[PDB]
Design a binder for this molecule. Structure first.
Ligand SMILES: NCC[C@H](O)C(=O)N[C@@H]1C[C@H](N)[C@@H](O[C@H]2O[C@H](CN)[C@@H](O)[C@H](O)[C@H]2O)[C@H](O)[C@H]1O[C@H]1O[C@H](CO)[C@@H](O)[C@H](N)[C@H]1O
Ligand SMILES: NCC[C@H](O)C(=O)N[C@@H]1C[C@H](N)[C@@H](O[C@H]2O[C@H](CN)[C@@H](O)[C@H](O)[C@H]2O)[C@H](O)[C@H]1O[C@H]1O[C@H](CO)[C@@H](O)[C@H](N)[C@H]1O
Ligand SMILES: [Mg+2]
Ligand SMILES: [Mg+2]
Ligand SMILES: [Mg+2]
Ligand SMILES: [Mg+2]
Ligand SMILES: [Mg+2]
Ligand SMILES: [Mg+2]
Ligand SMILES: [Mg+2]
Ligand SMILES: [Mg+2]
Ligand SMILES: [Mg+2]
Ligand SMILES: [Mg+2]
Ligand SMILES: [Mg+2]
Ligand SMILES: [Mg+2]
Ligand SMILES: [Mg+2]
Ligand SMILES: [Mg+2]
Ligand SMILES: [Mg+2]
Ligand SMILES: [Mg+2]
Ligand SMILES: [Mg+2]
Ligand SMILES: [Mg+2]
Ligand SMILES: [Mg+2]
Ligand SMILES: [Mg+2]
Ligand SMILES: [Mg+2]
Ligand SMILES: [Mg+2]
Ligand SMILES: [Mg+2]
Ligand SMILES: [Mg+2]
Ligand SMILES: [Mg+2]
Ligand SMILES: [Mg+2]
Ligand SMILES: [Mg+2]
Ligand SMILES: [Mg+2]
Ligand SMILES: [Mg+2]
Ligand SMILES: [Mg+2]
Ligand SMILES: [Mg+2]
Ligand SMILES: [Mg+2]
Ligand SMILES: [Mg+2]
Ligand SMILES: [Mg+2]
Ligand SMILES: [Mg+2]
Ligand SMILES: [Mg+2]
Ligand SMILES: [Mg+2]
Ligand SMILES: [Mg+2]
Ligand SMILES: [Mg+2]
Ligand SMILES: [Mg+2]
Ligand SMILES: [Mg+2]
Ligand SMILES: [Mg+2]
Ligand SMILES: [Mg+2]
Ligand SMILES: [Mg+2]
Ligand SMILES: [Mg+2]
Ligand SMILES: [Mg+2]
Ligand SMILES: [Mg+2]
Ligand SMILES: [Mg+2]
Ligand SMILES: [Mg+2]
Ligand SMILES: [Mg+2]
Ligand SMILES: [Mg+2]
Ligand SMILES: [Mg+2]
Ligand SMILES: [Mg+2]
Ligand SMILES: [Mg+2]
Ligand SMILES: [Mg+2]
Ligand SMILES: [Mg+2]
Ligand SMILES: [Mg+2]
Ligand SMILES: [Mg+2]
Ligand SMILES: [Mg+2]
Ligand SMILES: [Mg+2]
Ligand SMILES: [Mg+2]
Ligand SMILES: [Mg+2]
Ligand SMILES: [Mg+2]
Ligand SMILES: [Mg+2]
Ligand SMILES: [Mg+2]
Ligand SMILES: [Mg+2]
Ligand SMILES: [Mg+2]
Ligand SMILES: [Mg+2]
Ligand SMILES: [Mg+2]
Ligand SMILES: [Mg+2]
Ligand SMILES: [Mg+2]
Ligand SMILES: [Mg+2]
Ligand SMILES: [Mg+2]
Ligand SMILES: [Mg+2]
Ligand SMILES: [Mg+2]
Ligand SMILES: [Mg+2]
Ligand SMILES: [Mg+2]
Ligand SMILES: [Mg+2]
Ligand SMILES: [Mg+2]
Ligand SMILES: [Mg+2]
Ligand SMILES: [Mg+2]
Ligand SMILES: [Mg+2]
Ligand SMILES: [Mg+2]
Ligand SMILES: [Mg+2]
Ligand SMILES: [Mg+2]
Ligand SMILES: [Mg+2]
Ligand SMILES: [Mg+2]
Ligand SMILES: [Mg+2]
Ligand SMILES: [Mg+2]
Ligand SMILES: [Mg+2]
Ligand SMILES: [Mg+2]
Ligand SMILES: [Mg+2]
Ligand SMILES: [Mg+2]
Ligand SMILES: [Mg+2]
Ligand SMILES: [Mg+2]
Ligand SMILES: [Mg+2]
Ligand SMILES: [Mg+2]
Ligand SMILES: [Mg+2]
Ligand SMILES: [Mg+2]
Ligand SMILES: [Mg+2]
Ligand SMILES: [Mg+2]
Ligand SMILES: [Mg+2]
Ligand SMILES: [Mg+2]
Ligand SMILES: [Mg+2]
Ligand SMILES: [Mg+2]
Ligand SMILES: [Mg+2]
Ligand SMILES: [Mg+2]
Ligand SMILES: [Mg+2]
Ligand SMILES: [Mg+2]
Ligand SMILES: [Mg+2]
Ligand SMILES: [Mg+2]
Ligand SMILES: [Mg+2]
Ligand SMILES: [Mg+2]
Ligand SMILES: [Mg+2]
Ligand SMILES: [Mg+2]
Ligand SMILES: [Mg+2]
Ligand SMILES: [Mg+2]
Ligand SMILES: [Mg+2]
Ligand SMILES: [Mg+2]
Ligand SMILES: [Mg+2]
Ligand SMILES: [Mg+2]
Ligand SMILES: [Mg+2]
Ligand SMILES: [Mg+2]
Ligand SMILES: [Mg+2]
Ligand SMILES: [Mg+2]
Ligand SMILES: [Mg+2]
Ligand SMILES: [Mg+2]
Ligand SMILES: [Mg+2]
Ligand SMILES: [Mg+2]
Ligand SMILES: [Mg+2]
Ligand SMILES: [Mg+2]
Ligand SMILES: [Mg+2]
Ligand SMILES: [Mg+2]
Ligand SMILES: [Mg+2]
Ligand SMILES: [Mg+2]
Ligand SMILES: [Mg+2]
Ligand SMILES: [Mg+2]
Ligand SMILES: [Mg+2]
Ligand SMILES: [Mg+2]
Ligand SMILES: [Mg+2]
Ligand SMILES: [Mg+2]
Ligand SMILES: [Mg+2]
Ligand SMILES: [Mg+2]
Ligand SMILES: [Mg+2]
Ligand SMILES: [Mg+2]
Ligand SMILES: [Mg+2]
Ligand SMILES: [Mg+2]
Ligand SMILES: [Mg+2]
Ligand SMILES: [Mg+2]
Ligand SMILES: [Mg+2]
Ligand SMILES: [Mg+2]
Ligand SMILES: [Mg+2]
Ligand SMILES: [Mg+2]
Ligand SMILES: [Mg+2]
Ligand SMILES: [Mg+2]
Ligand SMILES: [Mg+2]
Ligand SMILES: [Mg+2]
Ligand SMILES: [Mg+2]
Ligand SMILES: [Mg+2]
Ligand SMILES: [Mg+2]
Ligand SMILES: [Mg+2]
Ligand SMILES: [Mg+2]
Ligand SMILES: [Mg+2]
Ligand SMILES: [Mg+2]
Ligand SMILES: [Mg+2]
Ligand SMILES: [Mg+2]
Ligand SMILES: [Mg+2]
Ligand SMILES: [Mg+2]
Ligand SMILES: [Mg+2]
Ligand SMILES: [Mg+2]
Ligand SMILES: [Mg+2]
Ligand SMILES: [Mg+2]
Ligand SMILES: [Mg+2]
Ligand SMILES: [Mg+2]
Ligand SMILES: [Mg+2]
Ligand SMILES: [Mg+2]
Ligand SMILES: [Mg+2]
Ligand SMILES: [Mg+2]
Ligand SMILES: [Mg+2]
Ligand SMILES: [Mg+2]
Ligand SMILES: [Mg+2]
Ligand SMILES: [Mg+2]
Ligand SMILES: [Mg+2]
Ligand SMILES: [Mg+2]
Ligand SMILES: [Mg+2]
Ligand SMILES: [Mg+2]
Ligand SMILES: [Mg+2]
Ligand SMILES: [Mg+2]
Ligand SMILES: [Mg+2]
Ligand SMILES: [Mg+2]
Ligand SMILES: [Mg+2]
Ligand SMILES: [Mg+2]
Ligand SMILES: [Mg+2]
Ligand SMILES: [Mg+2]
Ligand SMILES: [Mg+2]
Ligand SMILES: [Mg+2]
Ligand SMILES: [Mg+2]
Ligand SMILES: [Mg+2]
Ligand SMILES: [Mg+2]
Ligand SMILES: [Mg+2]
Ligand SMILES: [Mg+2]
Ligand SMILES: [Mg+2]
Ligand SMILES: [Mg+2]
Ligand SMILES: [Mg+2]
Ligand SMILES: [Mg+2]
Ligand SMILES: [Mg+2]
Ligand SMILES: [Mg+2]
Ligand SMILES: [Mg+2]
Ligand SMILES: [Mg+2]
Ligand SMILES: [Mg+2]
Ligand SMILES: [Mg+2]
Ligand SMILES: [Mg+2]
Ligand SMILES: [Mg+2]
Ligand SMILES: [Mg+2]
Ligand SMILES: [Mg+2]
Ligand SMILES: [Mg+2]
Ligand SMILES: [Mg+2]
Ligand SMILES: [Mg+2]
Ligand SMILES: [Mg+2]
Ligand SMILES: [Mg+2]
Ligand SMILES: [Mg+2]
Ligand SMILES: [Mg+2]
Ligand SMILES: [Mg+2]
Ligand SMILES: [Mg+2]
Ligand SMILES: [Mg+2]
Ligand SMILES: [Mg+2]
Ligand SMILES: [Mg+2]
Ligand SMILES: [Mg+2]
Ligand SMILES: [Mg+2]
Ligand SMILES: [Mg+2]
Ligand SMILES: [Mg+2]
Ligand SMILES: [Mg+2]
Ligand SMILES: [Mg+2]
Ligand SMILES: [Mg+2]
Ligand SMILES: [Mg+2]
Ligand SMILES: [Mg+2]
Ligand SMILES: [Mg+2]
Ligand SMILES: [Mg+2]
Ligand SMILES: [Mg+2]
Ligand SMILES: [Mg+2]
Lengths: 48, 275
RNA sequence: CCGAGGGUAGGGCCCGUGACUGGGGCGAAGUCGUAACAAGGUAGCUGUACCGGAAGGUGCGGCUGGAU
RNA sequence: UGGGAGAGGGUGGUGGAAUUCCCGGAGUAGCGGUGAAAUGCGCAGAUACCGGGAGGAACGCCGAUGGCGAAGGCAGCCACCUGGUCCACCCGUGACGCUGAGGCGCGAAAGCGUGGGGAGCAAACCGGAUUAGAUACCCGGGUAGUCCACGCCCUAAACG
RNA sequence: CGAUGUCGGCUCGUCGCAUCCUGGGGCUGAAGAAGGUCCCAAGGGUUGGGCUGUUCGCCCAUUAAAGCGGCACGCGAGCUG
RNA sequence: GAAUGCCGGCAUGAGUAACGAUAAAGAGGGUGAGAAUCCCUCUCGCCGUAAGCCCAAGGGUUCCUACGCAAUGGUCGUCAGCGUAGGGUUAGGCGGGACCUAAGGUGAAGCCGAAAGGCGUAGCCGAAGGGCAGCCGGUUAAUAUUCCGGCCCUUCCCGCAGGUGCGAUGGGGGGACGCUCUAGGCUAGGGGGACCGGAGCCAUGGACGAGCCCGGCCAGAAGCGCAGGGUGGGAGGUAGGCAAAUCCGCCUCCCAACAAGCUCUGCGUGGUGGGGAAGCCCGGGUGACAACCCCCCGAAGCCAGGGAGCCAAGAAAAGCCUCUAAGCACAACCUGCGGGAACCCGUACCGCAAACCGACACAGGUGGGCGGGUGCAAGAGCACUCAGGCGCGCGGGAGAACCCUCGCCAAGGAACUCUGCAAGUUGGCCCCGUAACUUCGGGAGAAGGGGUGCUCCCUGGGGUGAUGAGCCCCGGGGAGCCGCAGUGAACAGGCUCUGGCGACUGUUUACCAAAAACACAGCUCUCUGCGAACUCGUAAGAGGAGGUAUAGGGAGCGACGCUUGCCCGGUGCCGGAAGGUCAAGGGGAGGGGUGCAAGCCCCGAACCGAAGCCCCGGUGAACGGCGGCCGUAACUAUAACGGUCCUAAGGUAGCGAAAUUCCUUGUCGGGUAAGUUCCGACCUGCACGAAAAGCGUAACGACCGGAGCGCUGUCUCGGCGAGGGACCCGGUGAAAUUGAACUGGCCGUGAAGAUGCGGCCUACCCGUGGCAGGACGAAAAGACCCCGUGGAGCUUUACUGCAGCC
RNA sequence: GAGCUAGCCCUGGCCAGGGUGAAGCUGGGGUGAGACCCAGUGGAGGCCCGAACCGGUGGGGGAUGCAAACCCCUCGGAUGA
């Protein structure tokens, strides 16, 4: 049957992308907490 | 003159469609329509603020003229009578001798090809539009402005009609379609005659589907819900209301008046509505 | 081939019978009231509607086959 | 052909009296009701009186032992549409008449369907009296209905 | 109670005997035939249907008889539900 | 040494289950250390509205080639979507951008909010919608509408020629629209040919034939031809289209109207360029100068913005056209022609799947297009089959019980069982015929029955064409033939009677419930006069609604028919300017502290004083409620009748042992041999009852009852057979579980159910296939029960707050 | 966090074939004119049968599965809410 991951490059970018994060105040805290941990990627990789 | 169907399907037994006997033109005036932004009941938050709405036919809102004092003295011809899906009345297409074209809401009896006009010195004829103070006492009228220059607010549904009871200074006394007795200002315009398509109410939607086409989604009884959803929710098996019948948000719904008490319009209402 | 009739399937009319049920007729001296005949003690009758244990009552109309 | 009477029918419109309700005023201790009362209404200002407003229904006098219609039935007033009918003249057609099983149409009241309307009245129903009882007669309320449009119903002491 | 799956049916049985039948008996208000009652006896046998979830029970038609109980109201790492 | 401890390592179960659709395999020849598994050939089977082909998304080098086989591959491996290395993706016209707007998003103005932020007109963003210029063939191991070849087209820049009041982000037109049905003419596609072209073939009894077998095309500018679409022309006025306007709109007037004309598309033709089979020979080469024609079928595609009908009434904006305005008319724009110019991104491959989503090379999930042939009435159904693609990545044997799937069965035919659960029966088409009842549509495919193939003959109407032939499509009549059987295979209803609930088609607990539940048209009640009520929001602001009482909210009931009774005392709601109570505030009699005192400070009664509550009315399709005991008739029995107590009022109509009846399998009747179910009745209704609606109702139902027929392996009662497993051999190799084990029966005993204690009995050591009585077998720190001053959802006249409202 | 699921919004796409045959229109009858009837044409519908597609009724299998909801037989809807 249909499973829950239906991948989609546009969604994956307008939802979790960098610019989406920088618009919210909550989102900037995401990037801040992820830089602090030193995440290699602050954001899902999606080819576009 | 509402139209029946033979019972060749279960739904066709009771269904009745309009007769459309008074419609001349069958497509809108491309200069006077705009896109109707269907909302489905959601507000600017995206939140349903009006339940059970959505999914009806697409519609083109024909721009209707409710400030007929716009064109005082310029007669117009009644060129057509057309179907507006956005209201219960029919609408009439006016070709003004100005060359201007406008939609108004079609009064009863209005004859395609007749001419109409608006102003203080207008003839007291079906379709004309005068300030209230100049219409004879005892005249049936419609499209009544509530305040002057603010636009026609009262009596606009099929068959509605305010009757003029009398004058009292700057204010005439109207008997609204609800039976309320109100003072409206005499400078408020109004179109003499009653709104047409009175046979509107005698329509039998026939089946569930027809209600959907009107954008009306199914309506589930509070009695069918759970206590989390409704005052009437829950109960093992069936259940009377078990408390004074109430809305989904708590307030009682049998008799409980809701008009704001201190409303300033109170000063201008003579009789609360009848029946 | 047709063919008496046999069989299969489904119908129409009539007769008899049926738990129960509806009123009807009849049967010296059971119970409740008193509707009608006198203006019968609210003039009567009537079609209809609704009501009542029962006769009846009341509404709307109609007749005199109503007295004085 | 020329004349006449008429609440004959259908539509549109409209006038006044009365009742009810509503607003204003003036005013006070009862009003109403009956055989007698009670229910009811009224100092939260009723009834009685005056001005104003809304609405429905039915049309006083004329009115008659009257007129019209096939019957049921038809009554303020105005206009339109329209049926029948009678008199005059003796002009026209020349038996073209009478009745009428079926058919069809009309058909008081009540009653029914869909809208409207709703003042007075009033089945049902409530209450007050009477009474052995009183599912009545009497009194106070009162919902259909009574009115309008459309469509049914087709009954009658539809009787001379 | 860090789990002993709970009615009934089916399948498979196995035991007890306070014996339903069949075998052996005594008494009888046992003429015969057919019964009653008690004793011995568990080897074998102990039907098929209607009804109800039913166990049980009533009923149909038979029968030599249509016995009663135990085995976690025998049996769900056998089935059913 | 224990924590169902934590991390790790290694055991047990065990060479055990399994190795992922039962579409299927066999042999020969190659390569190689090694082959059932890789390569080639022949035979066999499978798919073929796909299991073939082309897009999209997503995947991201998986593509091609060479060398490799440690691991990945459920076995093997020489193979591979694996390892290493090299190659491979070419565009002005395909897609996206430098174009347009949609919802939505964002947001100069503006509004709002403690902060963060929320709104918001324009504007901007936003596509799989609008707009826009490329077709056919060849080429590479691998890209191609991209390279190449042929034939075409678009835009920008500059120049020449001709024409014209040129000029826009502003005005106007247009773009531009739904659903159903559908005409004419085409094309895609297809069938046939005794016509054209072709390597060949004569088999095994016949055939040298009008024999068999293969093929008989594709694109294409101008012009032209057929079919369509769109479109009036002139003049005068003009106050409207937020300036102007010659445009548009409105008015008048003349001419023209199924036409014609101009314009635009489609199809055909068309210079020209391509393609071109079977067969044989080693992807190629030949065939070949290949031929390339005739007839029929024919779209859902095209002409298209076609036509008709309907109600629920069917995007926007740009490109485009037209109008003018500043400006400018040395300009500028239109047309034709010429030269030049024309950027960024994608392009490999997978793409119903071994490459995407499912931890897997996972029987699951995934949108668009093409999807050939014959037959069956049709068809995308079904059976076979083309092109093409596959045999599912463990095999070989054996022919046990048992399990799955499947086939058949004597006589019986539901006797099975909770239940005909399951499986039979029926089955397409044509024809005949078809009941109660009904809302007159239905019920209805009721029921039940006949027919169905092949051959010969005779004949009727249609399409094409031409009116005929040929092709093709519907039929009619007559005579025959064969078998057990003619929808001979495959796909394709068992039917009927009678109740309960629900009107109906619909909706639902994704993953134990599809229902009688929710929804539903329809009925009633109630709120709402519009800055509406109501909803979300602190607000602004939205929805309501660009709606206006024939409208919108809330509530109940739930098509329809006939109906819906009595009670307002209590609760809710509605009404009530009086009375009673009532907080802050007003008032300040009257006291108090302090000071020499003026004063400063504190307490304070009467009285005025809102909502709410009290109080007076109203109100049931508001919440709700609708009695008890005793007596009475000339047989009995039973009470139409009465007496009394109480209530706000004492359940009306209809219904009733019911989806409700405890006693109860009530009693009686029907059905049956037999009926705790069922149907029809009665009525002392434990404990029906009228919009939490009452009683009915044709039709409808994968709902729940009962019955009859048909037919059966459900059953008496089982037997035989097929395949996939189970079994044996080779390859690979799990799991939960496990204190350790050298782990028998009985009778006892024991914490009361002992392999482990006592006594006795029995017992040589170890396996394999089997069965499930025990190991209080596994699994899950019982989900029932209690307990915890443990938690949570829900309720209310429990408490106490708060939003909101007054 | 609505790439699953629920609802709404905007923009597109899909539904083989067969069956029944409403209104209307025409013609005919009918009448004073009507209603009306008959025939033909027409092609309506939360109409019928059935693929795609959307479902998930019953039963069997599966239960350390092919699969953390699958497979087979059967079955509901399939121009509509
Ligand atoms: N004043 C009080 C009346 C009294 O009670 C009385 O007369 N009561 C009447 C008593 C008579 N015995 C009955 O008559 C019948 O019953 C008898 C049995 N006993 C029969 O034998 C007799 O052979 C028969 O005939 C009769 O039925 C009674 O009359 C009543 O019932 C009759 C039937 O409806 C009516 O007609 C009378 N109007 C009504 O009064
Ligand atoms: N009613 C009249 C009696 C008459 O004698 C008759 O034959 N009566 C009955 C006639 C019915 N039509 C039949 O009913 C059944 O069979 C029909 C086929 N024939 C089915 O269509 C029907 O759907 C089914 O329902 C039924 O079979 C007949 O029953 C007869 O046959 C039965 C078994 O043989 C017996 O048990 C009956 N007692 C006996 O009446
Ligand atoms: Mg699913
Ligand atoms: Mg996951
Ligand atoms: Mg998806
Ligand atoms: Mg922001
Ligand atoms: Mg992130
Ligand atoms: Mg119709
Ligand atoms: Mg109309
Ligand atoms: Mg019309
Ligand atoms: Mg426009
Ligand atoms: Mg918004
Ligand atoms: Mg003023
Ligand atoms: Mg509604
Ligand atoms: Mg509703
Ligand atoms: Mg509802
Ligand atoms: Mg519930
Ligand atoms: Mg919630
Ligand atoms: Mg609640
Ligand atoms: Mg409740
Ligand atoms: Mg409930
Ligand atoms: Mg209950
Ligand atoms: Mg208000
Ligand atoms: Mg004979
Ligand atoms: Mg015979
Ligand atoms: Mg028979
Ligand atoms: Mg006697
Ligand atoms: Mg009397
Ligand atoms: Mg008397
Ligand atoms: Mg009397
Ligand atoms: Mg008398
Ligand atoms: Mg009488
Ligand atoms: Mg009585
Ligand atoms: Mg009584
Ligand atoms: Mg009595
Ligand atoms: Mg009487
Ligand atoms: Mg009485
Ligand atoms: Mg009475
Ligand atoms: Mg009278
Ligand atoms: Mg005259
Ligand atoms: Mg005259
Ligand atoms: Mg006073
Ligand atoms: Mg009026
Ligand atoms: Mg007279
Ligand atoms: Mg004279
Ligand atoms: Mg004379
Ligand atoms: Mg004379
Ligand atoms: Mg003469
Ligand atoms: Mg003569
Ligand atoms: Mg003469
Ligand atoms: Mg009458
Ligand atoms: Mg009447
Ligand atoms: Mg009645
Ligand atoms: Mg009405
Ligand atoms: Mg009394
Ligand atoms: Mg007394
Ligand atoms: Mg009494
Ligand atoms: Mg008296
Ligand atoms: Mg009535
Ligand atoms: Mg009379
Ligand atoms: Mg008379
Ligand atoms: Mg326990
Ligand atoms: Mg049994
Ligand atoms: Mg058995
Ligand atoms: Mg034994
Ligand atoms: Mg004993
Ligand atoms: Mg004994
Ligand atoms: Mg003796
Ligand atoms: Mg003897
Ligand atoms: Mg003894
Ligand atoms: Mg023994
Ligand atoms: Mg016993
Ligand atoms: Mg029992
Ligand atoms: Mg018994
Ligand atoms: Mg014996
Ligand atoms: Mg026990
Ligand atoms: Mg037990
Ligand atoms: Mg079990
Ligand atoms: Mg059990
Ligand atoms: Mg079960
Ligand atoms: Mg079960
Ligand atoms: Mg159960
Ligand atoms: Mg320790
Ligand atoms: Mg563990
Ligand atoms: Mg082994
Ligand atoms: Mg083992
Ligand atoms: Mg496999
Ligand atoms: Mg496996
Ligand atoms: Mg296999
Ligand atoms: Mg296979
Ligand atoms: Mg070698
Ligand atoms: Mg293999
Ligand atoms: Mg997708
Ligand atoms: Mg991947
Ligand atoms: Mg490639
Ligand atoms: Mg390897
Ligand atoms: Mg290897
Ligand atoms: Mg190796
Ligand atoms: Mg390997
Ligand atoms: Mg540039
Ligand atoms: Mg844009
Ligand atoms: Mg914003
Ligand atoms: Mg685009
Ligand atoms: Mg392009
Ligand atoms: Mg190479
Ligand atoms: Mg090229
Ligand atoms: Mg110009
Ligand atoms: Mg439009
Ligand atoms: Mg439509
Ligand atoms: Mg072509
Ligand atoms: Mg063909
Ligand atoms: Mg030969
Ligand atoms: Mg030859
Ligand atoms: Mg203007
Ligand atoms: Mg302008
Ligand atoms: Mg302006
Ligand atoms: Mg202007
Ligand atoms: Mg101007
Ligand atoms: Mg002309
Ligand atoms: Mg032309
Ligand atoms: Mg072409
Ligand atoms: Mg050559
Ligand atoms: Mg050559
Ligand atoms: Mg040659
Ligand atoms: Mg299509
Ligand atoms: Mg077409
Ligand atoms: Mg157009
Ligand atoms: Mg200028
Ligand atoms: Mg200038
Ligand atoms: Mg110049
Ligand atoms: Mg030009
Ligand atoms: Mg050039
Ligand atoms: Mg650039
Ligand atoms: Mg880029
Ligand atoms: Mg490529
Ligand atoms: Mg591919
Ligand atoms: Mg593929
Ligand atoms: Mg696909
Ligand atoms: Mg693949
Ligand atoms: Mg995956
Ligand atoms: Mg994978
Ligand atoms: Mg595989
Ligand atoms: Mg797969
Ligand atoms: Mg799906
Ligand atoms: Mg195709
Ligand atoms: Mg064919
Ligand atoms: Mg197709
Ligand atoms: Mg091939
Ligand atoms: Mg392949
Ligand atoms: Mg296999
Ligand atoms: Mg086994
Ligand atoms: Mg058999
Ligand atoms: Mg049989
Ligand atoms: Mg049973
Ligand atoms: Mg059954
Ligand atoms: Mg079955
Ligand atoms: Mg059968
Ligand atoms: Mg019919
Ligand atoms: Mg029929
Ligand atoms: Mg039926
Ligand atoms: Mg049949
Ligand atoms: Mg039937
Ligand atoms: Mg046959
Ligand atoms: Mg054949
Ligand atoms: Mg043959
Ligand atoms: Mg022809
Ligand atoms: Mg023969
Ligand atoms: Mg067949
Ligand atoms: Mg079928
Ligand atoms: Mg039957
Ligand atoms: Mg029952
Ligand atoms: Mg239903
Ligand atoms: Mg239906
Ligand atoms: Mg579920
Ligand atoms: Mg779920
Ligand atoms: Mg269902
Ligand atoms: Mg209803
Ligand atoms: Mg709120
Ligand atoms: Mg606001
Ligand atoms: Mg709006
Ligand atoms: Mg309900
Ligand atoms: Mg009925
Ligand atoms: Mg009473
Ligand atoms: Mg009350
Ligand atoms: Mg009260
Ligand atoms: Mg206080
Ligand atoms: Mg106070
Ligand atoms: Mg107060
Ligand atoms: Mg109620
Ligand atoms: Mg009631
Ligand atoms: Mg007695
Ligand atoms: Mg006596
Ligand atoms: Mg009382
Ligand atoms: Mg009761
Ligand atoms: Mg009652
Ligand atoms: Mg009973
Ligand atoms: Mg009960
Ligand atoms: Mg019984
Ligand atoms: Mg019983
Ligand atoms: Mg039962
Ligand atoms: Mg009782
Ligand atoms: Mg009884
Ligand atoms: Mg009761
Ligand atoms: Mg109720
Ligand atoms: Mg009926
Ligand atoms: Mg029913
Ligand atoms: Mg259904
Ligand atoms: Mg169902
Ligand atoms: Mg068997
Ligand atoms: Mg057995
Ligand atoms: Mg086998
Ligand atoms: Mg073996
Ligand atoms: Mg083995
Ligand atoms: Mg041992
Ligand atoms: Mg012991
Ligand atoms: Mg022991
Ligand atoms: Mg043991
Ligand atoms: Mg073994
Ligand atoms: Mg065991
Ligand atoms: Mg354990
Ligand atoms: Mg255990
Ligand atoms: Mg525990
Ligand atoms: Mg419990
Ligand atoms: Mg405590
Ligand atoms: Mg405690
Ligand atoms: Mg606690
Ligand atoms: Mg979604
Ligand atoms: Mg997605
Ligand atoms: Mg669409
Ligand atoms: Mg398709
Ligand atoms: Mg079709
Ligand atoms: Mg047919
Ligand atoms: Mg036809
Ligand atoms: Mg159709
Ligand atoms: Mg349908
Ligand atoms: Mg299919
Ligand atoms: Mg299933
Ligand atoms: Mg599914
Ligand atoms: Mg289910
Ligand atoms: Mg199973
Ligand atoms: Mg279907
Ligand atoms: Mg729809």
């Amino acid at each position: 049957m249909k499973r829950t991951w239906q991948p989609n490059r546009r969604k994956r970018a307008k939802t979790h992308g960098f610019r989406a994060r920088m618009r919210t105040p909550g989102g900037r805290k995401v990037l801040k907490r992820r830089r602090q941990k030193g995440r290699w990627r602050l954001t899902p990789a999606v080819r576009k | 003159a509402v139209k029946k169907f033979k019972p060749y399907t279960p739904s066709r037994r009771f269904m009745t469609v309009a007769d459309f006997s008074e419609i001349t033109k069958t497509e809108p005036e491309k200069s006077l329509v705009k896109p109707l932004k269907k909302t489905g009941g959601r507000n600017n938050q995206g939140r349903i603020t009006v339940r059970f709405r959505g999914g009806g036919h697409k519609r083109l809102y024909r721009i209707i003229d409710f400030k007929r004092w716009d064109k005082v003295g310029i007669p117009a011809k009644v060129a057509a009578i057309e179907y507006d899906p956005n209201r219960s009345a029919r609408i009439a297409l006016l070709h003004y001798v100005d060359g201007e074209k406008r939609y108004i809401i079609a009064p009863d009896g209005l004859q395609v090809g007749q001419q109409v006009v608006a102003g203080p010195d207008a003839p007291i004829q079906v379709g004309n539009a005068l300030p209230l103070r100049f219409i004879p006492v005892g005249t049936v009228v419609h499209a009544v402005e509530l305040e002057p220059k603010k636009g026609a607010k009262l009596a606009r549904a099929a068959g509605t009609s305010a009757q003029i009871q009398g004058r009292e200074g700057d204010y005439v006394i109207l008997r609204l379609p609800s039976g309320e007795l109100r003072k409206v200002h005499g400078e408020c315009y109004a179109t003499v005659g009653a709104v047409g398509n009175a046979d509107h109410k005698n329509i039998v939607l026939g089946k569930a589907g027809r209600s959907r086409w009107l954008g009306r989604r199914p309506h589930v009884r509070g009695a069918a819900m759970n206590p989390v959803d409704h005052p009437h929710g829950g109960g093992e098996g069936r259940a009377p209301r078990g408390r004074p019948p109430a809305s989904p948000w708590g307030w009682q719904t049998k008799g409980l008046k809701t008009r704001k008490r201190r409303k300033p319009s109170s000063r201008f209402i003579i009789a609360r509505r009848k029946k």
